[PDB]
RNA sequence: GAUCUGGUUGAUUCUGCCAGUAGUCAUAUGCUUGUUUCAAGGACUUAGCCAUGCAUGCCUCAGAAUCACUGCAUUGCAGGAAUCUGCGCAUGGCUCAUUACAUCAGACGUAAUCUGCCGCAAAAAUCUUGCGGUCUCCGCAACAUUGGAUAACUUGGCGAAACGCCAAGCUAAUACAUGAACCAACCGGAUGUUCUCUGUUCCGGCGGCAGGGCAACCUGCUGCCAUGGGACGUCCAGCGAAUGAAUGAAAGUAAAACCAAUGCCUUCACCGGCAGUAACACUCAGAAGUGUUGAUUCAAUUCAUUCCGUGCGAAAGCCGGGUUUUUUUAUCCGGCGUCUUUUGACGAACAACUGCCCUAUCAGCCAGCGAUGGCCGUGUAGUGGACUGCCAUGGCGUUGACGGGAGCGGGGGAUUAGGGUUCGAUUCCGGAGAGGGAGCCUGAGAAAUAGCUACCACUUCUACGGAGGGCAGCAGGCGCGCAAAUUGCCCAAUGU
RNA sequence: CAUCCAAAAUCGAGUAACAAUUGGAGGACAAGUCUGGUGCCAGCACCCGCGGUAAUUCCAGCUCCAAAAGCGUAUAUUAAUGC
RNA sequence: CCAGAGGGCGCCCGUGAUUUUUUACUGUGACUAAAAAAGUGUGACCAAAGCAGUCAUUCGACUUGAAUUAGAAAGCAUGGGAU
């Protein structure tokens, strides 16, 4: 079927390869999985390793992480703002690695207020800590910008990290 | 190998040259491999300079090498 | 997946013939590699001669009358490589296979308490889960909890009576050492020096007794003991010294006059 | 054996080919042969077409027997059909058509990946079962005492035939689906409107009350906490996989307080002082302060969220040895079998260093639709223009690119004093193919062809409604050409 | 294939009919001063050349030569080739 | 269970070179399937062949033999330092 090979392609000399061999099942493309938003649907496929890999369709939730404090919580994926690859993708709100996105942001808020025995732990954690301004404004409103740092098209789980100052400032200005 | 051209972005073109021997005529011949490499943005050697290049995993269609050092 | 082997493409350290038969046995995968191993059936039939035919080797082994590593085997085909003790309790004999001088499989005969000793070269060390360190060997054995002084390419004395590891021996310095493969097989000598070439094979220079130095790859070093008077295990028929072609021929004639 | 013999002329000496001459596991062909030993053998001419038969199936002591099957036995045993289950059939065998940066040979890498069988090994998550009362709730007890179908078979059958099929009734498991408390070690973090020591003070915070208020805020009073450890309660904790964060040492001299915490020595003290010092505010005064590599974002450890079936049963498994009479018993042991995790081996899949016949009356080749590279993704077991999108304008060539012709490649054969010359279809190794093409399932591994699906060229049956076939597997037949064996016997040997 | 023709007892050569052939005899190239037949015909001849009635070469016989249970012929390829 | 003294090797890393330094070639050494070829031993009756067998003399011995060499380039290590 679909194959991944250099033997239907031109050489560096501009010449053409000539065949003598029918295509292997070792070399083997498959059609791309389309992860979007909506109800979760997961269709496995069997692979050559004797194990299954999972085709994410329509994931509307992700496991997101806040940098620097070494934490994470689940939250809901709402929108896709941006992508490097195309504009077309963004409009359909496809989810593929290194798309900037938008999340519910609620659990992070909740967490950070918890960041008598309790009470003095807080005061210690308040000390020697600060947060970027562009972060906190968004985090107040209850929306945030994050990146999806796992490939959802072959695991059917979408995990992401939350943008921090250096990189956040770039993606912001691209909008 | 030397530098054949500096053209392309982060990719150079190296030319090895060696000698093959032919038994019947008892005499050598000159034969060159023109090869492509991915030059790190650290280095930028001039044409005619000599380069050293290692064995890395594939990086493009033709490129398998990388620039360790420059003379 | 290969499941057939032809006599010529098989080792002739198994000492098969060109004529008689067409196939040779391809052993089941195990501790040892295809070239360095010798399959059960070959041993029993062509050397020991407790069998005259293939079917007779099945008769003995399937039933069970034969042990290797002190474990009884119901396997018809199994590898037997190097430093393996095999015991047939019916005869009451204990063979220890080794590399004889001149590239031949040695079958050497040992006292009974030596047949509980075994030597395994370490290949990798690594930490596994729970922080539990592991030495993985050249026979595929896993030594749990090895000494903190263990390194790649060292030997671990291994009790087969009950499984554990007593004190090690290193490849460090001059020590009595023997070769595996490379056609310097069974030749024994001190390590004179260990050369390093990083990113490539590390040469080592060995010097056998009565001089005559030579070079073999680090990979082909297998330690024996601290010293030649501290050896834990027996030597094959020749001591690990080779002789010149002329002297071979001379001695062959001298004995043939009897 | 390093060999020059005839042929141009009236006669002669050259140049020069022709003819003679010896080999060939090199083929054909004529004629001729009394025996033995050793053998190639439909490659060449069409990888043309095929009548007929046969060519991978398999169970012990150990997965399932109520054959209405057979013996011994008389509600007991052994054989045991074909049927479910498991494993193998992708290897061997045969054939050279494609094919020149291909394929292959020597050397090399896969820190870029998969891997059944085999070997050495690893394994502490799991709230279950039974009975009694009883509300779907409790109390006890603890070789765990689990559930539901389906074939052979039986019954009705269908069809011209078909390695074609239907309904109903049965009943198994190491098939399938469930599920294991107690047994249970060790390791931490989040903590709680639990109380017990506590900081003989105020720079800060929090709660309550009163007064004023521009409702932003200020003042007064009371209680609690502030670098601390115990006691008690609660929640998360395993392996495998995903993401973020930390870890995965270091090697550029020795003055002596200056600031807070804190230890030790010392006195009586919260005074003085620095002799001692892995770690160490607990139950451990050493129960990891230290993974392997030339090189790692790798091994592994910790913390925070996760996984939803597409991961994790002690097979809820089988067969024996006894003890020990009461056998028929929690008295013990042995041999097999399986889930998941782990890494050697056997292999699979990629990549590259070097090498390879003739031809220029084949000199320019390559990019719309990927040509060369960069950037971000997608896909794959994995690296990669392998592929999408964006950006850049490169890449190769007289040291012969590109195109064409001939050819499976190598080990090796023949011939040669030497240098060479020529052959390789063919026993071994590597690759590719199964009428021509493409697509696919299953499986650890296949783009399999005595597996499947479709088309095309052929081709076989049919009461013509339909159903099939693939010898370049062994014999054998037709065709072909100068040209090539028996429709034999055997699993005794050699292997699987 | 081998071992045997009794170990008490088991076969068999004298034209040794159990009978060797295939190509050659002018030169190259080992072997005819032959005899008959044919007469530029028939044919031989890799090549040089034989045959027109006087054939060392044709068609037959005898004789001798080379190899030998093998020997001729065709084509390709290698040596011969320093073509 | 030696203060001091310069140290002496081994191991790893850091720093320093006015310009470190290479290659062909050669000697030696590594690393490299069998079959085939060259070759050693051996009376398969000899021989192409094979890797066998041979001896006492019995309830095995020979530590039974099954050597060894070559095998284009290219890659590997280390001497040499003329061209």
UniProtKB/TrEMBL annotation, chain A:
One of its GO terms (biological process) is translation. GO terms for molecular function: structural constituent of ribosome. It comes from the Eukaryota. GO terms for cellular component: ribonucleoprotein complex; ribosome. Gene3D superfamilies: 3.10.290.70. Keywords: Ribonucleoprotein, Ribosomal protein. The keyword Repeat does not apply. Pfam families: Ribosomal_S8e (PF01201). NCBIfam families: eS8. Belongs to the eukaryotic ribosomal protein eS8 family. This is 40S ribosomal protein S8.
TrEMBL record, chain B:
Coiled coil: none annotated. It comes from the Eukaryota. Belongs to the universal ribosomal protein uS17 family. This is 40S ribosomal protein S11, putative. The lineage of its organism: Eukaryota, Discoba, Euglenozoa, Kinetoplastea, Metakinetoplastina. The chain holds residues 88 to 158 of 173 of the full protein.
From TrEMBL, chain C:
Residues 170-197 form the KOW domain. The keyword Iron-sulfur does not apply. Residues 39-102 form the RNA-binding S4 domain. Keywords: Ribonucleoprotein, Ribosomal protein, RNA-binding, rRNA-binding. Signal peptide: none annotated. Gene3D superfamilies: 2.30.30.30, 2.40.50.740, RNA-binding S4 domain. Pfam families: 40S_S4_C (PF16121), KOW (PF00467), Ribosomal_S4e (PF00900), RS4NT (PF08071), S4 (PF01479). The keyword Repeat does not apply. HAMAP family: Ribosomal_eS4. This is 40S ribosomal protein S4.
């Amino acid at each position: 079927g679909i194959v991944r090979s250099r033997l239907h392609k031109r050489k560096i000399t501009g010449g053409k390869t000539k065949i003598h061999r029918k295509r292997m099942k070792a070399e083997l493309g498959r059609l791309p999985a389309h992860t979007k938003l909506g109800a979760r649907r997961v269709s496995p496929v069997r692979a050559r390793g004797g194990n299954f890999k999972l085709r994410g369709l329509r994931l509307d939730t992700g496991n997101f992480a806040w940098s620097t404090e070494a934490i994470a919580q689940r939250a809901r994926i709402l929108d896709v703002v941006y992508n490097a690859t195309s504009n077309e993708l963004v409009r359909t709100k496809t989810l593929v690695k290194n798309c900037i996105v938008v999340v519910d942001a609620a659990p992070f808020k909740l967490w950070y207020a918890k960041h008598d025995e309790l009470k003095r732990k807080w005061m210690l954690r308040r000390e020697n800590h600060k947060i970027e301004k562009a972060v906190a404004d968004q985090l107040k409103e209850g929306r945030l910008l994050a990146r999806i740092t796992s490939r959802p098209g072959q695991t059917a789980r979408a995990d992401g990290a939350l943008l921090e100052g250096a990189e956040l400032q770039f993606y912001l200005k691209k909008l | 190998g030397v530098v054949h051209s500096t053209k392309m972005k982060r990719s150079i073109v190296i030319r090895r040259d060696y000698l093959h021997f032919i038994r019947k005529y008892q005499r050598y011949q000159k034969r060159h491999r023109s090869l492509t490499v991915h030059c790190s943005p650290c280095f930028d050697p001039k044409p005619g300079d000599e380069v050293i290049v290692g064995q890395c995993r594939p990086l493009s269609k033709t490129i398998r090498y990388n620039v360790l050092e420059v003379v | 997946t290969k499941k057939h082997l032809k006599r010529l493409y098989a080792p002739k350290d198994w000492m098969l013939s060109k004529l008689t038969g067409v196939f040779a046995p391809r052993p089941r995968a195990g501790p040892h590699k295809l070239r360095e191993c010798m399959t059960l059936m070959i041993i029993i039939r062509n050397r020991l001669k407790y069998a005259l035919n293939a079917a007779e080797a099945q008769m003995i082994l399937r039933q069970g009358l034969v042990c290797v590593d002190g474990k009884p085997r119901k396997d018809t085909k199994y590898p037997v490589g190097f430093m393996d003790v095999v015991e047939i309790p019916r005869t009451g004999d204990r063979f220890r296979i080794l590399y004889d001088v001149k590239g031949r499989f040695a079958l050497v005969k040992v006292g009974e308490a030596e047949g509980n000793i075994k030597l395994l070269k370490v290949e990798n060390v690594y930490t596994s889960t729970g922080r539990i360190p592991v030495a993985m060997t050249h026979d595929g054995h896993r030594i749990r909890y090895p000494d903190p002084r263990t390194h790649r390419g060292d030997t671990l004395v291994y009790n087969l009576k009950e499984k554990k590891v007593v004190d090690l021996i290193k490849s460090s310095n001059g020590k009595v050492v023997m070769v595996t493969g490379g056609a310097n097989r069974g030749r024994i000598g001190e390590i004179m020096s260990i050369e390093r070439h990083p990113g490539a094979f590390d040469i080592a220079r060995l010097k056998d007794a009565a001089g005559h130095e030579f070079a073999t790859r680090a990979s082909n070093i297998f330690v024996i003991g601290k010293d030649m008077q501290s050896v834990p295990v027996t030597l094959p028929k020749q001591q690990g010294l080779r002789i010149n072609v002329i002297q071979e021929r001379e001695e062959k004639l001298i004995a043939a006059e009897a």
